Ligand binder design. Structure first.
Ligand SMILES: [Zn+2]
Ligand SMILES: [Zn+2]
Ligand SMILES: [Zn+2]
Length: 178
């Protein structure tokens, strides 16, 4: 197994995957690493199993159909994995915890949003469709772009949104376009 957390790239108290060489801090894995279960298989492994069981699940899909999907166990898992792929980027630090807004010439967003809030909402089964989760994720970056205006710090929202969108297209097998 790896000697660093797959998500944050630090050592510490790591739980090791049985079916692949990845390791995780308890609360870095999503969902949080399960109490018992021997063997244990990480989220990467669980996603790969879905694909192997149904190879056609990789054929291209329309985003509008994906978003309307109910949050059954397989879609729950895909959203968890997509959230995890965002936390894997170190620039997710800026979007993880609850933001506050006091900048001359800007007003805060009407509906603040942050990664840990989305994480709690997924854990508590608050989303009934994929659209709920995607809307909140995109709201994080939209709020940031609007608040920071012409400051160069706006680029951090563009960068992390690009990680989100690439991973959304990969995990949910969105049909490739020009
Ligand atoms: Zn970690
Ligand atoms: Zn694994
Ligand atoms: Zn199948």
């Amino acid at each position: 197994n790896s000697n660093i957390c797959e998500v944050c790239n630090k050592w510490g108290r790591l739980f090791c995957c049985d079916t692949c060489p990845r390791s995780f801090h308890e609360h870095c894995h999503i969902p949080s690493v399960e109490a018992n279960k021997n063997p244990w298989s990480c989220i990467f492994c669980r996603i790969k199993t879905i694909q192997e069981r149904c190879p056609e699940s990789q054929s291209g899909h329309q985003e509008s159909e994906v978003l309307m999907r109910q949050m059954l166990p397989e879609e729950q898992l895909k959203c968890e994995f997509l959230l995890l792929k965002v936390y894997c980027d170190s620039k997710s630090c800026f979007f993880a915890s609850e933001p506050y807004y006091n900048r001359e010439g800007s007003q805060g967003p009407q509906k603040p949003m942050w990664l840990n809030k989305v994480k709690t909402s997924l854990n508590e089964q608050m989303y009934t469709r994929v659209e709920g989760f995607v809307q909140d994720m995109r709201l994080i970056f939209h709020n940031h772009k609007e608040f920071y205006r012409e400051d160069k710090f706006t680029r951090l929202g563009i960068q992390v949104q690009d990680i989100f969108e690439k991973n959304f297209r990969n995990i949910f097998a969105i049909q490739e376009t020009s």
